[PDB]
Design a protein around this ligand. Structure first.
Ligand SMILES: COc1ccc(-c2cc(N)[nH]n2)cc1
Length: 331
């Protein structure tokens, strides 16, 4: 759909400019003459596949809207939706630029542990809200691009893009999440729950501080090999139940598992998060040496929290309420 600047819709919206495009369609900046404010309008493609998935997005955003709690305000606000020219249109508040843009602006050197902490607290609060029993919403595509600043002057953030999201027990696709942020249970083809978003968050927070993705797999096999470098071979009790385990691993006589080797990775569990973060060595690439708020003790709390987020076992992986009580967040 070609949307000209100055185009007026329904004696209400004046289209200004293109913010973004996705597989789903496009996001435009528009002036709402009724509320007298600028808004973001997500315009879905006029194809059944994109319409039907955006209808789930509208349902989940409206479900969240009717849950007024102090935990709901880290999610982008859907103001309303309408059909126009056979396109479903979702109207949101305006937000600012995304956390990938923030990282690009650091030259991929990362933000401070103090700003990482502020982002972590907001995102853990959002995940606590989505875990409300009557919502039980799995975002399914958390990544820096889907986390937006509320204001370019400030460090408040909101999650956007519920285009992949589903309630617990309403799973459609086995192949979900962006690869760098994909949980082991999804790589392994297992039934997933809200814990896959906590995995993603763990990955995101390390990247926000280092500047680089923690696990930048070129395909699923490379992804799982990059996870095993840092965390070791997944536990047997997980691999024993995993449809896709033999995509990556081999089982032996004594019920133990090992990596499937291909043509010539660091040995399992030897690429230590301790060294990626530079806990004892001045932070990532030693670039935080002597900076305030980047002490070994600060780093050890961060490292502990991340390793709880990167638990292989989705049943024992830290949950949002308990992540909010972690020492990383204590003054
Ligand atoms: C730049 O302001 C915005 C505001 C909202 C969005 C959005 C909301 C959802 N569900 N996807 N994308 C994007 C950018």
């Amino acid at each position: 759909m070609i949307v000209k600047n100055g185009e007026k819709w329904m004696d209400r919206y004046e289209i200004d400019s293109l913010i973004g495009k996705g597989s789903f369609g496009q996001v435009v900046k528009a002036y709402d003459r009724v509320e007298q404010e600028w808004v973001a309008i997500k315009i879905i493609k006029n194809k059944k596949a994109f319409l039907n998935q955006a209808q789930i997005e509208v349902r989940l955003l409206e479900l969240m809207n009717k849950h007024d709690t102090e935990m709901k305000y880290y999610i982008v606000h859907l103001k309303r939706h309408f059909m126009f020219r056979n396109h479903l249109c979702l109207v949101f508040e305006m937000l600012s630029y995304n956390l990938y843009d923030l990282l690009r602006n650091t030259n991929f050197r990362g933000v401070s542990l103090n700003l990482t902490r502020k982002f972590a607290q907001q995102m853990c609060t959002a995940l606590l809200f989505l875990a409300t029993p009557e919502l039980s919403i799995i975002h399914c595509d958390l990544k820096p691009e889907n986390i937006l600043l509320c204001n370019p002057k400030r460090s408040a953030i909101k999650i956007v893009d519920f285009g992949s999201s589903c309630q617990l027990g309403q799973r459609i696709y086995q192949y979900i999440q962006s690869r760098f942020y994909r949980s082991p249970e999804v790589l392994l083809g297992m039934p997933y729950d809200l814990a896959i978003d906590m995995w993603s968050l763990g990955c995101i927070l390390v990247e926000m501080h280092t500047g680089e993705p923690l696990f930048s797999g070129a395909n699923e096999v490379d992804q799982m090999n990059k996870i095993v470098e840092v965390l070791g071979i997944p536990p047997a009790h997980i691999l024993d139940q995993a449809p896709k385990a033999r995509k990556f691993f081999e089982k032996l006589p004594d019920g133990t598992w090992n990596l499937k080797k291909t043509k010539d990775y660091k040995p399992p569990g030897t690429r230590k998060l301790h060294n990626i973060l530079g806990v004892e060595t001045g932070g990532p690439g030693g670039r935080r040496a002597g900076e305030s708020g980047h002490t070994v003790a600060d780093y050890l709390k961060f490292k502990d929290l991340i390793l709880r987020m990167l638990d292989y076992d989705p049943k024992t992986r830290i949950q949002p309420y308990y992540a909010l009580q972690h020492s990383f967040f204590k003054k």
